[PDB]
Ligand binder design. Structure first.
Ligand code: HEM
Ligand code: HEM
Lengths: 393, 393
């Protein structure tokens, strides 16, 4: 038999029984990635947190030439250290401030957008596709507003993402074509005097402030492309698979419909059980480091399996059940942990909360319109998502 | 180990090594379908032809209540015998005449449509998706013209197909919703005095002719829905995967570009090697019948594996190679054989020939824009297709 291959399944509606067997038997174990590289797959809550909280397991060094790879780069190697670059340019606080859901008018914009999308689906009649015609457009609209860019520019930027977020053994020529185009777009945005709000409006101002005169135009454009992509793919994908989890729990659907004040707790549990990340989070060891029964050697690749942590019964008893009264509800790793904890966590929560609130109000009878096994799961991608999500109501 | 399950792979770019091993060892053998039923999978050219040419292996009887099933019905059971119903209504010759590619102006329409689609892709710039933005729209436009219906009605009818042609273990609620809507649409077309050309224009006339006064309005509408769906899914899917086969053979691409008069021979070979049909063709035995070393019993399900026949080296030496000078070039089973031989075979050939001619003229440098393994193959569907086909040129 060959060395255990990752990822195990592209299906995002259920966790393989094998994850629990692996966590019990070998919570750090050797695997082969799609590139043919070896890696250590970490699958218990304790060991996942250990790796994520130890910066000697480096994100930046995953981009080093000659390293064992999970998958091919789809961005320039310097862009793997995007947040480090942002910090070094003195831009971290400004970026963080631009991406909070608390910005005036933003939540009402989200609600208005969700409700319009849903009204259009109701007008057209069932079946509706909740990914392509709800969750993804909601994510796209949100991120255009957050960035300060025209809504009509969203679709073309969105269309890069089915390739930009591939998880490929080999470099992807289309990724570079789209990256270079999208960078040119963001560079134009920075020069556009009409763009005065949101993240790009703020970066535009900082660009002309003496305190940032030696920050490169490349970095400013890169922030725009990377935040649009990461935010849109992450929120669209999470909301889509959260909707599946909800639709398959009619009792929970009914409870949240009846008591919408429980939606934040529900969304936190949907985050905990979410299978949106298709691969473990990669890190490269910069030292020899003991992780459980394994001495990881300098230069080795480590993969932090989020669902390994999040379904660990030692930390989350009855891990497969959505319980709205857990004593440790935000202690999941859906947003990572440590140095690279998700900058967009509050925005991600709000997108999902508002999307779900709107859907339950407009479509309280929502149900799948096809048997669950008929969903088509995207392969060799950094997220798990159904290509279409057909529903009726 | 469990009984061998079908289908073997949803990948449409390569035949599994296992097909040849099976044909050699056990050219009729027992398998389990997605419903849990047992079936006989037939995989040699000799045995596939035998089954297809013996009407005691019945298409109609596959719809019988209580039969072992390949997959769930997505149409009313009477619609499985659509061609029998057409014949009995005296409509077979008229339907055949309406779907030939030789109709005045049709081939020029195909060429004009292909060229417009391609010009739009060139204007937008690489990468382009040759399935969603070329092959499928070309198929849809063709079938609206063939039916005599407005081009602007094509997209909505097309959108039914990702569900109508599912290969599901269980009935699909959305299939019935879309079927009933599409039937209402075709019924309206038959009543619409503006619709005077194509298949629906002819059926409209025959409907009011005394020789067809006791043919049901249900049958007339059913012909419209079934011919649109079967034709669009079959041509769109075939052309898409033929384009992959061509793109992966730069020499052949160059030869057909240089000598376009060889395109018909090329398309015949692309048909022969095509993996578009995801499942064997189902038949139910109506008698005990010897097939190779197996006595198939009355009531048993038989699956005719088209690629089993078409890659059989006993009939097609060097079966995986496209050879434009074979002595038996149309003797493949891409269009079936016998009673249920494809009514649209000439139209299917023309769609593909014209699409390929246009693509090679406009995009002689066409190549995949992503590694081939990055294509996402649709699962649990009656065809094998990539969800997107990214190319550059
Ligand atoms: C529910 C939605 C989201 C989920 C589940 C999610 C998940 C994650 C995870 C797991 C990480 C850690 C990656 C690692 O440590 O290797 C991360 C980091 C990150 N997230 Fe999110 N994310 C979401 C939404 C967003 C949004 C809306 C944005 C911005 C608009 C965003 C921007 C980022 C960025 C820029 C990082 C990199 C942090 C770093 O490398 O230091 N995310 N996210
Ligand atoms: C390259 C394109 C096509 C391919 C590969 C294809 C393939 C096939 C195959 C394999 C069968 C036999 C099914 C069986 O025996 O169980 C068939 C039958 C059929 N085809 Fe096609 N087809 C194509 C295009 C079309 C088009 C354009 C139309 C109509 C516009 C069409 C209409 C039909 C119909 C109505 C049948 C049923 C015949 C019967 O049950 O007696 N097909 N096709």
């Amino acid at each position: 038999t060959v060395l255990l291959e990752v990822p195990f399944s592209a299906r995002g509606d259920r966790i393989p029984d094998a994850v629990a067997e692996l966590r019990t038997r070998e919570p750090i174990r050797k695997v082969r990635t799609i590139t043919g590289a070896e890696a250590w797959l970490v699958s218990s809550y304790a060991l996942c947190t250990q790796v994520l909280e130890d910066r000697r397991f480096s994100m930046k060094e995953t981009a080093a030439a000659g390293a064992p790879r999970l998958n091919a780069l789809t961005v320039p190697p310097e862009v793997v250290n995007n947040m480090g670059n942002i910090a070094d340019a003195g831009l971290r606080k400004a970026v963080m401030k631009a991406i909070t859901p608390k910005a005036p008018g933003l939540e009402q914009f989200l609600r208005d957008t969700a409700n319009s999308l849903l009204d259009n689906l109701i007008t057209e009649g069932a079946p509706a596709d909740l990914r392509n015609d709800f969750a993804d457009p909601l994510a796209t609209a949100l991120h255009c507003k957050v960035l300060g860019i025209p809504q009509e520019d969203g679709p073309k930027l969105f269309r890069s993402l089915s390739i930009a977020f591939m998880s490929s053994a080999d470099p992807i020529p289309a990724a570079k074509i789209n990256w270079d185009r999208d960078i040119e777009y963001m560079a134009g945005i920075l020069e556009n005097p009409n763009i005065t709000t949101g993240l790009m409006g703020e970066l535009s101002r900082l660009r002309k402030d003496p305190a940032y005169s030696h920050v490169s135009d490349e970095l400013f454009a890169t922030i725009g492309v990377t935040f649009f992509g990461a935010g849109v793919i992450s929120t669209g994908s999470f909301l889509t698979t959260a909707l599946i989890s909800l639709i398959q729990r009619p009792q929970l659907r009914n409870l949240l419909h009846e008591k919408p004040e429980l939606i934040p707790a529900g969304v936190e549990e949907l985050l905990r059980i979410n299978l949106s990340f298709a691969d473990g989070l990669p890190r490269l060891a910069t030292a020899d480091i003991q992780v459980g029964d394994v001495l990881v050697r300098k230069g080795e690749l480590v993969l932090v399996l989020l669902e390994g942590a999040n379904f660990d019964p030692e930390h989350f008893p009855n891990p497969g059940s959505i319980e709205l009264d857990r004593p440790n509800p935000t202690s999941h790793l859906a947003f990572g942990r440590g140095q690279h904890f998700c900058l967009g966590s509050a925005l991600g929560r709000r997108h999902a909360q508002i999307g779900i609130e709107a859907l339950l109000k407009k479509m309280p009878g929502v149900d799948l319109a096809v048997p669950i096994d008929q969903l088509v799961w995207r392969t060799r991608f950094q997220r798990r998502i159904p290509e279409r999500l057909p529903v009726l109501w």
